[PDB]
């Protein structure tokens, strides 16, 4: 009979859930544009290590990324990727870490491939700051810093980095949390 009354109801419910998705996406899509960094440095924050830990040694989760931080309002768009448990040459062994270039909107004008320092380093919120770190150079030959195709290329990085136990049994993890710092260049990079 009044079958219309539900017809509308039903119409109202999805359009409704729609917003509960949009209004939702605008949630995570509020940190990026809030944890954003345009100078070249950046701090990837990670709470819930133990949890993050397991999910990784497990299989469900194992490949975290980070706030797309750029090297200046209209420049490169790079990012990091942690592997708590570790992969490639250290899956079980210990924590691995990588740098990475996404695809940008201004990314077109930029000179390719990449070529800038990157002191990605694990901090240390202990009381002495003896936080492990390291940087390298983008090698044109090996495909990983050349002008982007998809949205993010072969996350290049220095596998073996902070080793499990040394990281787990130390002064690096605090309140089940740790901070990472990648250091890209910029100078030897003609500003806009």
């Amino acid at each position: 009979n009044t079958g219309l009354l539900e017809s509308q109801l039903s119409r109202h419910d999805q359009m409704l859930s729609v917003h509960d998705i949009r209004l939702a996406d605008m949630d995570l899509r509020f940190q990026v544009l809030e944890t954003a960094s345009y100078n070249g440095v950046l701090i990837w924050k990670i709470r819930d290590y133990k949890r993050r830990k397991q999910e990784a040694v497990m299989g469900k989760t194992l490949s975290l990324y980070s706030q797309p931080f750029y090297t200046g309002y209209f420049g490169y768009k790079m990012c990091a990727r942690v592997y708590l448990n570790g992969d490639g040459m250290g899956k079980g062994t210990h924590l691995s870490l990588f740098f990475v270039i996404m695809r940008g909107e201004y990314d077109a004008l930029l000179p390719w491939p990449f070529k800038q320092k990157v002191t990605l380093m694990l901090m240390d919120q202990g009381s002495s700051r003896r936080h492990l770190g390291d940087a390298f150079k983008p090698d044109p030959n090996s495909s990983s810093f050349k002008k982007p195709t998809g949205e993010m290329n072969i996350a290049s990085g220095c596998p073996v980095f902070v080793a499990q136990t040394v990281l787990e049994n130390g002064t690096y993890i605090k309140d089940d949390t740790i901070f990472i710092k990648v250091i890209v260049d910029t100078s030897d990079l003609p500003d806009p």
Binding site: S63, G88, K91, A135, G157, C158, P159
Partner: peptide, 24 residues
């Protein structure tokens, strides 16, 4: 001292080279 290895996303063993030695 040497860096610049690569993405270990499970699968391809490399074009006959990939690795990384450290953690020491």
């Amino acid at each position: 001292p040497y860096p610049i290895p690569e993405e270990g996303d499970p699968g391809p063993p490399g074009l006959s080279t990939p690795h990384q030695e450290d953690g020491k």
